[PDB]
Amino acid sequence: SRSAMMYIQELRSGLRDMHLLSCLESLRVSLNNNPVSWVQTFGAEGLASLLDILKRLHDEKEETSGNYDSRNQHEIIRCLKAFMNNKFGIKTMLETEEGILLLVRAMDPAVPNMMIDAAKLLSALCILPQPEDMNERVLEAMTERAEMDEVERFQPLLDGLKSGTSIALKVGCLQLINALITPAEELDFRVHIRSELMRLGLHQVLQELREIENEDMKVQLCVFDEQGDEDFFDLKGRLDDIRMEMDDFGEVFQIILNTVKDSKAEPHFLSILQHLLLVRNDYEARPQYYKLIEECVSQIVLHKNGTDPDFKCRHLQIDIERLVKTKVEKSEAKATE
Amino acid sequence: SRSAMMYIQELRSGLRDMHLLSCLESLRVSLNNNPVSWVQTFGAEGLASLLDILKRLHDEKEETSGNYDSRNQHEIIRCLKAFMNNKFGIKTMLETEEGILLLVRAMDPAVPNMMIDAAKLLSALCILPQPEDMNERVLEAMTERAEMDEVERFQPLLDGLKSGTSIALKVGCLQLINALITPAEELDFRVHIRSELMRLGLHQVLQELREIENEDMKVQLCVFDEQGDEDFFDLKGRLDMEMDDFGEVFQIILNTVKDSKAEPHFLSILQHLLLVRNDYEARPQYYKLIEECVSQIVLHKNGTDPDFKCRHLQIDIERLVDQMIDKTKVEKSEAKATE
Ligand SMILES: [Cl-]
């Protein structure tokens, strides 16, 4: 069998095009078929060589790129996959300066098969329990990439979910979305990330995705929904805590003003109060009005499915069946007595 | 004379610069000098083709704009004014999809003299008794403009009140403020608009206007104060007093709801505000949305939502509240029949 050292030497000898690919293809077969023993002789040195090559193809502007650049990037990613299917391999991948960012950069929707593979590896990394905030390390890399390209960090994932893509790509994009959100301890993080996806157009995408006759998509959708529901209930529990602690009118008001102080929220708070003063000064109507307002504020702030209200939307759906013929006239008719 | 059809054809070639301007200039003279039978010949079709050019011009990116764009926009506003100087023309303007909006977009503080002409036409629209919601159609147009240009809807009006502007502009902006508020039937609505002006800083702006030795400005200020005064007294009649103090406003709500069935709901509303996501960018938006829902609820009158910006709920609010009242009186008399 071919030695890890032979491969390292070849990788550093400036292979191009079909020759590069030949080498990467052979290495990939070696990586998948050899014992972990052999992967270790490949090691950090071997990994570093793959990542340099991937870097310098990733960096290559459209006008000077080779015809086999995609193929070669993708073949490197298949090598990373093989390198990482064992404990030594993931560990050393995590220990790199740039491995995760280069995996993020491989998430190119114009090369969807490479994007499927890079997303599957980023998901596996998010779900690792050690080190501790792996999902945040993956998100950090996504953010770095967005900063360097001046793009929204979740845009490639959203592009992967467009109607024209393969089902495998849709499923892998939603899988990575689940892997970023679900392992997060903090409710605030999850709602933040979820609301960020929604502002990018996730909701309409989801509507489309719900029509797909595919079991794996149904599973990822379900996992996405479960987590939204769990977050709704965790937030609903936070509201009960508040309703129990904060029962002094002056103190609640003081805390709101502290929160809202010198922010763009302050003029909106005043306006809320100013409009309350304009509630129908009518003994039987005024309680109903305040109830209706409470119903509304309730459904805004405790928004269903654990996401912010869509602030760009014209209309806001409020469940009103919980608040509400000539049955009033005939019941008062029991004035018979 | 030049016929209405000739103008409509000219307006539909691709006239540019001084050529467009001289077409527009003779058109204006035709509109001011010919019989009203002539304006009817120009009609909705001549109107639409004017509004089309205006649209393209409003739209134009600075670096592809002609040297005479603003001159041509302004001359169309002069033609709009002439077209509207009669019952047929004003009526057909009201009927357009975008005339009012295009008028509002002409209110550009960088071209003050066009802004004056446009604001004057919008004030005349607001003051029409028929249709009955003309101030709401103008406010709607102001909200749509604010969304495009990404600004506060009353900012261009406060811009025209700035010290560096001409007196004609200041007077025109205040007249239009007056025309939005004064024809409004509902105290709620006048207070809503005036309150918004105030949060945008109108008060400090007004104090400076009070210093100008100009009769027209003094008129617009007195009209503003007299309506404000009346509103204050109508509202004091309802409550028994200041609008922009947080603590004072809060206390008055408290007193208003204290020991009634509204009081539990008011506390819970405040408590729900504490749940608003602790995020720099999302929090103002949560407050904004809540505010615009509260405004709609309070402003709603027999199927009408007077403010376009406060139409998030697709609910017949008063009908709903009537149903809610209905439910409380069935429980009360049913409770009373059982016993
Ligand atoms: Cl490929």
From Swiss-Prot, chain B:
Transmembrane segments: none annotated. It comes from the Eukaryota. Residues 1-305 form the GBD/FH3 domain. Disulfide bonds: none annotated. It is found in: Cell membrane; Cell projection, Ruffle membrane; Cytoplasm, Cytoskeleton; Cytoplasm, Cytoskeleton, Microtubule organizing center, Centrosome. Signal peptide: none annotated. Disruption phenotype: Knockout mice show normal organization of the cerebral cortex with no significant differences in cortical white matter or callosal thickness. Histological analysis of coronal brain sections at early and postnatal stages shows unilateral ventricular enlargement. Widely expressed. In the organ of Corti, it is expressed at the outer and inner hair cell layers. Expression at the inner hair cell layer is restricted to inner pillar cells. Detected in cochlear spiral ganglion neurons. Belongs to the formin homology family. Diaphanous subfamily. Actin nucleation and elongation factor required for the assembly of F-actin structures, such as actin cables and stress fibers. Binds to the barbed end of the actin filament and slows down actin polymerization and depolymerization. Required for cytokinesis, and transcriptional activation of the serum response factor. DFR proteins couple Rho and Src tyrosine kinase during signaling and the regulation of actin dynamics. Functions as a scaffold protein for MAPRE1 and APC to stabilize microtubules and promote cell migration. Has neurite outgrowth promoting activity. The DAD domain regulates activation via by an autoinhibitory interaction with the GBD/FH3 domain. This autoinhibition is released upon competitive binding of an activated GTPase. The release of DAD allows the FH2 domain to then nucleate and elongate nonbranched actin filaments. Homodimer. Interacts with the GTP-bound form of RHOA. Interacts with RHOC, PFY1, MAPRE1, BAIAP2 and APC. Interacts with APC; acts as a scaffold protein for MAPRE1 and APC to stabilize microtubules and promote cell migration. Interacts with SCAI. Interacts with DCAF7, via FH2 domain. Interacts with NCDN. Interacts with OSBPL10, OSBPL2, VIM, TUBB and DYN1. This is Protein diaphanous homolog 1. The chain holds residues 133 to 474 of 1255 of the full protein.
